[PDB]
Ligand binder design. Structure first.
Ligand SMILES: [Zn+2]
Ligand SMILES: [Zn+2]
Ligand SMILES: [Zn+2]
Lengths: 110, 110
């Protein structure tokens, strides 16, 4: 199992909003900056959010992040078929002195 | 301790070449695609290499990857002051059925 907990899968239709939860502890998500990235087999992995809610240059505002307490969420509005991919949250764990990641959420566009 | 083993730090002067090694086992690097990303605290993390040796769109060719047997290496030619960051390797680990990552390499440009 993963140190950070994500749902294995999420699905919605084009144009709809999806959110992906990521649950942790005070040692990791509670006290530390959360990042998110996506990877679909065959294409490059790409970071979408960092420092909880900031977007790399080139990521559109359809993507956003919110962290409160020991949970972080990635929101995707205007869902596009090109958003199909595995999505992962990650953060530093102060107790383990190590980066930890969620186990991944497969996003299916219906 | 991290599943994949990287040197803790490397250092070189601007213009020089640096290589950063990443070592695993047949369960991970030996039979799975390796990716690399960089994170300089305060800036967006970014993927540099995936599927052993492919560059994401937007990454210039002075970054390269090589993987042979149970080890993988990242190369950076024409080192720039802007290349200061922490560099991580990652792969699928077939015995964990999970992604695993190296502990990170801090790169200082002297
Ligand atoms: Zn992946
Ligand atoms: Zn980082
Ligand atoms: Zn560091």
């Amino acid at each position: 199992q993963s140190v950070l907990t994500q749902p294995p899968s999420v699905s919605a239709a084009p144009g709809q909003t999806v959110t992906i939860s990521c649950s942790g502890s005070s040692s990791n998500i509670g006290n530390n900056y959360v990042s998110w990235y996506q990877h679909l087999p065959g294409t490059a992995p790409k970071f979408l959010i960092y420092d909880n809610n900031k977007r790399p240059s080139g990521i559109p505002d359809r993507f956003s992040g919110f962290k409160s307490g020991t949970s972080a969420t990635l929101g995707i509005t205007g869902l596009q078929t090109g958003d199909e991919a595995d999505y992962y949250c990650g953060t530093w764990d102060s107790s383990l002195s190590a980066l930890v990641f969620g186990g991944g959420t497969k996003l299916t566009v219906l």
